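=== Structure Prediction Worksheet ===
Name of assembly: unnamed complex
Input type: mixed (protein and possibly other molecules)
Chain count: three
Listed entries:
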Amino acid sequence: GGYLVDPQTSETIRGVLRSTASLRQIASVVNVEATSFDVLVDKTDMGS
Amino acid sequence: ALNSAVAAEGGYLVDPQTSETIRGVLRSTASLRQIASVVNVEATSFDVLVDKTDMGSGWASETAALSETATPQIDRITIPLHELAAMPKASQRLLDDSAFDIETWLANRIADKFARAEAAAFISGDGVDKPTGFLTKTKVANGAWAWGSLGYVATGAAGDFAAVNASDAVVDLVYALGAEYRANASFVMNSKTAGAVRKMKDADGRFLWAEPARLMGYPVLIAEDMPDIAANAYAIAFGDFGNGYTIAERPDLRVLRDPFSAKPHVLFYASKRVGGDVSDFAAIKLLKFAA
Amino acid sequence: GWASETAALSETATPQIDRITIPLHELAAMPKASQRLLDDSAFDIETW
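=== Predicted Assembly ===
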């Protein structure tokens, strides 16, 4: 009778869990539809 | 997620589908139950009542004063109606973890085993706790035929059929069976006797006999429990078994599961009860190979 | 024990019981006080 026992197969197959802390939640994310993105910064300030 | 052959690269996800219903070797169901008189009976014993004789007629004259005439004397045949019991032992871990319906599979397999095991008792069974088959009924040669016995015709030579006139030991067996019984009559043989019958041929090599595998227009039950062609054996029978042999039974299969005696096992106790012997001694003739 | 799927399955054991008796003794005291120094003292020794 041991041939007809047929174990179950754990309906959702799992994996090893890896951390998802990814620096996207602290940095600034910009949607871009081009080949490249720029920023325009100010390396100096004005005068008085 | 790679090729399905090697185990670690996705071979453990391949889950071989089992069959729908557990199959088995399909053993013989040609059991003489389909040709005889099967009678439901809720009792200990069944009593057929046959007429072993008949009456007399007068052709009474105009002025004769008609006297008495005969009146048929009557025989009672007691079917013993024994039981047939099988008790397989099945484990509780199997019955809980064995997704096939194991209980109805055992109820089918026990039923097949019983329908096959009663076929041996219907043909060659003795008296002790089993039905007496028609081979064990004190065979007396035909012509000197009494009611308390079965008739036979003999073939000639001891081991086999007759030398000069082979295969008419069959035809006089047919035409020595009674003109009303041949309306629905049948041969009963086993397979290696029917093969030896089919191997018979004329003086030129062609088979002289020409899915149910009937012989001379009469159907043949290929049993598996008659004797083969031995020195004084009764390998071939012929007759109207629907009148000749009476099967008495209960048409159900009593199962009791037993979780108590064998403790981690389930131990199905199944027993149907079945009996029967010959009711009409004229309706079965035999072929003896003696002389 | 875990039952070997195939086994005789004999009886395991039974918790052996035990009666512990609390014999319920008595604790008594007999101060023998004189009849003089119970009715000639100013302090009620009989209640003290």
